[PDB]
Each structure stands twice: as C-alpha cells, then as structure tokens.
Amino acid sequence: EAIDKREEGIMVKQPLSIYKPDKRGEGWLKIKPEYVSGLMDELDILIVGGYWGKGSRGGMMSHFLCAVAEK
C-alpha cells in the first residue's frame, strides 16, 4: 500500500518496548522497498568523469560523474 501511495516505507514497533536514547534495533524496525531484493529498478549508465578522494582514499578516483546517451 505504501508503494501504491508513493511513500518511503513502513515502521514496525513493539508495544511493550521502553524508550532507550541513542539505541538502535531494540523495539523499532523499518522496512523500505530498497531493502527487499528485486523490488527496484536499476540504471545502466556510463562513467564520463572522475574526482579525487579524501584522506582514507587519497591518491585515487573515489567519486565519479555519470551520463546517459543520446538516441
């Protein structure tokens, strides 16, 4: 239904769960279409440019600029 209404996803919560600051995966869960395999459309695009990287990956092209073709 969320996919029908063009929404991000759904959340599932446990009724007997207390509040715990800064804690993940205790009583709250999320489901998005991306997390389910096959439910998304993927794009095949070309790499037309590159950028240099920051500290952990310095002397290599870390991010890229992609382009689609013209019929």
Next chain:
DNA sequence: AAACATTCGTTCACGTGAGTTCCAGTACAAGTCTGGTC
C-alpha cells in the same frame, strides 16, 4: 611313563570419548567517506 592339546593370566597395539587451548566465522557498533537540496 612320555608327548601333545587346552586354558589361563599376562602383554602389546589400536580405537573411541572427554577435557583444554587456539583460531576462524559471526554479530554489532562506531568511524569515515559520499550525495542531494535549500
């Protein structure tokens, strides 16, 4: 009366179960890099 077969307590090797140490696989959390717009 003498020779041969059987039996018995002993011995060794080999196999299997339980305890201990070490390492690989798994899980989770935090850190680091990136993307997009307003």
